[PDB]
Design a protein around this ligand. Structure first.
Ligand SMILES: O=C(Nc1ccc(F)cc1)c1n[nH]cc1NC(=O)c1c(F)cccc1F
Length: 281
């Protein structure tokens, strides 16, 4: 730690405390995350390689005195605070669209290298004054105070052990709908409550929409059978392009669910721009 001065506690991460810190030598301000098996060492080292404009840059990995610290480029806000701050009027749609597009870019990159996030949520989406948004804590999940289930894909909730990059698309779809409506899509407060909120909005899945569902580990023939709601009721006043895209990001069957790369080609992004957010630091 010596080479750093903790300027302040930024928050209580999943894997430990987060500090804003200044490199006593380089002068650079940074995010310092306190988290040791060699596997965790090997995973995090891979992470140093996947550099992308929409991934929070992992500056350094300090394994000293059998402790683990990750050093990340610092950004001044996350999407959760910005949403609360924009509750009154909502985030403008052009900004929502730009955030969605850049996030999809980040995902398409990670996914092309077979790296999933697994835990997307507005808290780990960081933004700057220049209109950029970045995925934070990418890959930390494989490598390793209630954790939110609100963005969890249903195949995870159903006990699927070998899930795909589709889980991140699902989470990002949930975040998309939340930006638009200013309300969490599926605010579950247990794994069953989470699952059943999903069922209530999208319909109880069956073998028609999701072949193999009924054979999943935690699936029960006894689940109530709810009817799917219509999306126009779910995310007004998102336009038809947005709704089409959202519906594809929220497909039950992970194999039907749109990829990040395919989502980038959707006509919703036909008119994408890069607006600057007004944020007060
Ligand atoms: O937290 C960060 N920035 C930030 C600063 C002030 C805020 F109000 C808000 C945000 C940050 N900058 N760079 C990386 C960061 N955070 C993470 O990587 C991170 C983490 F280590 C653990 C959990 C969530 C994270 F986003």
């Amino acid at each position: 730690m010596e080479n750093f001065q903790k300027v302040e506690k930024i928050g209580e991460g999943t894997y430990g405390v987060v500090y804003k810190a200044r490199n006593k030598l380089t002068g650079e301000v940074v995010a310092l995350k306190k988290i040791v098996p060699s596997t965790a060492i090997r995973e995090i080292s891979l992470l140093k390689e996947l550099n992308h404009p929409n991934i929070v840059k992992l500056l350094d990995v300090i394994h000293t005195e059998n402790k683990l610290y990750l050093v990340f480029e610092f950004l001044h806000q996350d999407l959760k605070k910005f949403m609360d701050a924009s509750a009154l009027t909502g985030i403008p749609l052009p900004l929502i669209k730009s955030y969605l597009f850049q996030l999809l870019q980040g995902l398409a990159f990670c996914h092309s290298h077979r790296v999933l996030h697994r835990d997307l949520k507005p808290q780990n989406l960081l933004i700057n004054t220049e209109g950029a948004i970045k995925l934070a804590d990418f890959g930390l999940a494989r490598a390793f105070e209630v954790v939110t289930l609100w963005y969890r894909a249903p195949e995870i909730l159903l006990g699927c052990k070998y899930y795909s990059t589709a889980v991140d698309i699902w989470s990002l779809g949930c975040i998309f709908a939340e930006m638009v409506t200013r309300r969490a899509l599926f605010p579950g407060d247990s794994e069953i409550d989470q699952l059943f909120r999903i069922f209530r909005t999208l319909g109880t899945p069956d073998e028609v929409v999701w072949p193999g569902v009924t054979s999943m580990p935690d699936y029960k023939p006894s689940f109530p059978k709810w009817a799917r709601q219509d999306f126009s009721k779910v995310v007004p006043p998102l336009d038809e392009d947005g709704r089409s895209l959202l519906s594809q990001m929220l497909h039950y069957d992970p194999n039907k669910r749109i990829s990040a790369k395919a989502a980038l080609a959707h006509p919703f992004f036909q008119d994408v721009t890069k607006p600057v957010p007004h944020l007060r630091l």
